[PDB]
Amino acid sequence: NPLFSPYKMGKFNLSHRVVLAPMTRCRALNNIPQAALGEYYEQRATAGGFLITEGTMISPTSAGFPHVPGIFTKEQVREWKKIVDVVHAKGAVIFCQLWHVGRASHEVYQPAGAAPISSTEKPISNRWRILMPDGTHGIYPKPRAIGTYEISQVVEDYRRSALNAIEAGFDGIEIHGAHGYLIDQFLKDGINDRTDEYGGSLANRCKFITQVVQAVVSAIGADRVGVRVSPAIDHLDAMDSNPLSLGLAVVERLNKIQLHSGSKLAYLHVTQPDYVAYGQTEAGRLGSEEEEARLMRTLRNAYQGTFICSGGYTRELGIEAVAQGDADLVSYGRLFISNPDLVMRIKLNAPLNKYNRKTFYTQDPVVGYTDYPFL
Amino acid sequence: NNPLFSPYKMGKFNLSHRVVLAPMTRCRALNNIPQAALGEYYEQRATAGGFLITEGTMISPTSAGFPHVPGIFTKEQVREWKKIVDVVHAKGAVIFCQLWHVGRASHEVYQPAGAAPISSTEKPISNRWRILMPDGTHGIYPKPRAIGTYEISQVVEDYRRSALNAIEAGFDGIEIHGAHGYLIDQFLKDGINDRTDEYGGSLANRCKFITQVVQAVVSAIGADRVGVRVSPAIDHLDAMDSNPLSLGLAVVERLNKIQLHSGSKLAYLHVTQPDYVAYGQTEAGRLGSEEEEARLMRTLRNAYQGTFICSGGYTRELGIEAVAQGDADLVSYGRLFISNPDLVMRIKLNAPLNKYNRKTFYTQDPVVGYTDYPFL
Ligand SMILES: NC(=O)C1=CN([C@@H]2O[C@H](COP(=O)(O)OP(=O)(O)OC[C@H]3O[C@@H](n4cnc5c(N)ncnc54)[C@H](OP(=O)(O)O)[C@@H]3O)[C@@H](O)[C@H]2O)CCC1
Ligand SMILES: Cc1cc2nc3c(=O)[nH]c(=O)nc-3n(C[C@H](O)[C@H](O)[C@H](O)COP(=O)(O)O)c2cc1C
Ligand SMILES: Cc1cc2nc3c(=O)[nH]c(=O)nc-3n(C[C@H](O)[C@H](O)[C@H](O)COP(=O)(O)O)c2cc1C
């Protein structure tokens, strides 16, 4: 089983290749990490296994979900420290995902009810609804388009939060640049309508994510920085006219950063739509051999370093990914929600618990969080 | 006792088990003419008292968007279909012909005089989807032509004539392919139908076309020989709707009314399940979980006065639970039936199943990947 061959992720000697994908769960009451997060990650940690935390706030304006953790205050650092200590006592490596939602927010999640910030003034269309603190779903408002200086301050918010993660004992951080959030709002040409140095060409639309990654690489080292992107996911109206083009341009920038710095990033982490059920339709699988369909392999081939694939992977699919060189590591989201011992289950090829969408974003520290049973 | 093998009275048709061959385009009907290979293919899969639904069958020269799909709009096609039906009936199976117009899901290569495909709209399917071309490449859907009410009535007439033709060929009945973004679904879904006449806008307006199609075929061959297939929640070919449950319920109410007005029940309602599963997103008109998906299916079933067939990713275990819980009366299987000619028997005995080869789903070979899948 290739999933359980060791892999050297930069400075971290992993004993297997099953990764916990980052997953917002909203148990961090008042944006402060709670003891329950420690129990949740401890359940899923394994000796030599890699974990990536739920998206974590980098500033008071970065939230778009209720009760998600921050790491921009020293109070949060102290609470994260206790969670990190418990995961490390199980021998796992854990990275903190740094998350700014950009325009995917609401006045209720913003200080003084301010407008959320983005690359643009265009709001997410009404095709999408935001989860509200009361449990209803609200409308995405009109965001404020930020100037060059505010962009530098946001970059500094990434830098300071990476430093805060190291201060909490995290082995590294992951830059959330996927799923139509702030970084994706600069990447995707379906969103970025700027005419300044951050908009227009492929090159200009990559400047934000380049500035963010370089800032954190300089602060804590390339080998403690992972970068997550989703060029082929159109979440929250974040589609690009050429996701192949955009993926390769990101890969180029990551390679140049690694070359300029003399060291490799911890990994590139690419996540894709899950098309598991498109086989049941007449035309669902037509086009599967086009280059744009082979995007995951194209980016892997162009990238120098560790590659984590994500989106719809199973035990069988993840084994195949590693053995074919499509990826070095495979991250699992939904399966890890309901299977705390997913690593053991994948190893034994044991049955897998089903997950419950209703309890993905509730505040209960136990129900739908830590009460999914072990084998 | 396996509930899949308790008998079922689907109108005047007495079935021995509830495992159904789902309708499956396979492209062996060279030049749109049923060939002997279809006879062998359907015979291999027929069982005593089993129900087979054929591949989508063209109702007119404009109705095709795959190569070498059969038609049933010529008498030559009727004659060749008759030999296939006879072979299936020889084994005691019930078989319905699925009548299928692809609408905008076509290409000039498939249309008379290279004309534009017809649809409710002039909007093409997006570049997220492809068409199978005759040479086996995957191509781009072109811009369709939106038809007026008179042309709509002529399409209705095509269905009616093709339904009469199927019964003439000996088919026990027909199925209306009103699902998966094809012509009928292009009228149903408000993600496709941007019309402003009496066929567009409101739900009732958007259900006009399928109502007239079903009523025409019902009146021509009798309601108990008509099945209706829909897919209210589906990504396929951009066929999304802002409210799939309410769209589904409105179709069900029209079917219930057609039944009450004609004094008889349709053969069945056939619903396919979504081609997706959510990942914690919140999109207008997308089902958010398998639970929301399951409730949608059962809500449609409970609202419909008659037989319910469910399809889309079913296994032996999920089919048994579906019938056991009363969520469906019959379960149609597609891909597993491609690779297991004796799928029914394998499900009865809980035997291992053959893998299937997607590569030969749509080739023209009369044997390879069609009839050479082994029996138990
Ligand atoms: N004894 C067996 O192993 C049997 C397996 N069966 C099926 O026959 C096929 C056997 O071939 P395989 O063992 O080499 O697996 P493969 O076809 O290469 O793909 C495995 C899964 O990945 C799915 N999958 C494929 N391509 C894509 C894609 N682009 N995007 C997302 N998902 C995809 C695929 O769906 P479809 O095969 O397209 O219907 C399938 O569910 C499989 O589809 C398998 O599920 C029947 C029952 C018996
Ligand atoms: C409840 C939930 C929360 C998620 N939160 C995040 C997140 O905070 N950051 C992120 O990059 N991806 C997030 N994702 C996406 C997952 O990390 C992962 O890419 C996706 O679920 C991959 O699908 P898989 O379940 O097939 O493994 C989340 C997914 C779910 C279902
Ligand atoms: C190769 C192939 C061809 C199909 N052709 C048709 C068709 O012509 N008409 C239709 O309504 N559905 C068609 N379908 C969808 C199937 O009828 C059925 O709903 C689907 O296979 C889902 O069930 P499964 O998991 O058992 O394969 C087709 C599916 C496949 C895989």
Curated annotation (Swiss-Prot), chain A:
GO CC field: peroxisome
Where does this protein act, in terms of pathway?
Lipid metabolism; oxylipin biosynthesis
Q: Which positions are annotated as binding FMN?
A: 22-24, 55, 97, 228, 312, 333-334
Q: Which reaction does it catalyse?
A: (1S,2S)-OPC-8 + NADP(+) = (9S,13S,15Z)-12-oxophyto-10,15-dienoate + NADPH + H(+)
- Looking at the record's lineage, which domain of life comes first? Eukaryota
| Chain positions recorded as substrate binding sites | 176-179, 274
Q: Name one GO molecular function term.
A: 12-oxophytodienoate reductase activity
Location comes to: Peroxisome
What induces this protein's gene, according to its Swiss-Prot or TrEMBL record?
A: By wounding, locally and systemically.
Biological process (GO) annotations?
jasmonic acid biosynthetic process; oxylipin biosynthetic process
State the similarity comment. Answer: Belongs to the NADH:flavin oxidoreductase/NADH oxidase family.
Task: Please identify the protein, giving its name as recorded.
Answer: 12-oxophytodienoate reductase 3
Species this protein is from: Solanum lycopersicum
Which lineage do the record's taxonomy fields give for this organism?
Answer: Eukaryota, Viridiplantae, Streptophyta, Embryophyta, Tracheophyta
